Amino acid sequence: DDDDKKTNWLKRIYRVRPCVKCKVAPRNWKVKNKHLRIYNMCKTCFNNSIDIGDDTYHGHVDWLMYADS
């Protein structure tokens, strides 16, 4: 089943690349209708980046959650 290839990929994509900033925590994310938005940082490091004034790691990658578009 093709939807499961996509789901297992997202599961892996999410797991093997932690927060770009602290490198250990997993990334923040949310579901935005038909896509999964994976933010570049965990929530702790994102808030911290505002405080310290660094917007270098700000960003996200959206992933279609289904196999067919």
Ligand X SMILES: Nc1ncnc2c1ncn2[C@@H]1O[C@H](COP(=O)(O)OP(=O)(O)O)[C@@H](O)[C@H]1O
Where on the chain is the footprint of Zn ion (CB under 5 A)? Answer: 19, 21-22, 25, 42, 45
Tokens of 27: 């990334």
Instruction: Indicate which single residue of 19, 22, 32, 54 sits in contact with a second copy (rule: CB under 8 A).
Output: 32
Burial of 15 (0-12, 13-18, 19+ CB in 10 A): exposed
Helix, strand or coil for residue 39? strand
Contact call for residue 64 and a second copy (CB under 8 A) = yes
Cβ neighbours of 45 (radius 10 Å): 22
Contact call for residue 63 and Cl ion (CB under 5 A) = yes
Binding footprint of a second copy on the chain (CB under 8 A): 2, 5-6, 9, 13, 32, 34-35, 37, 40, 59-64, 66-69
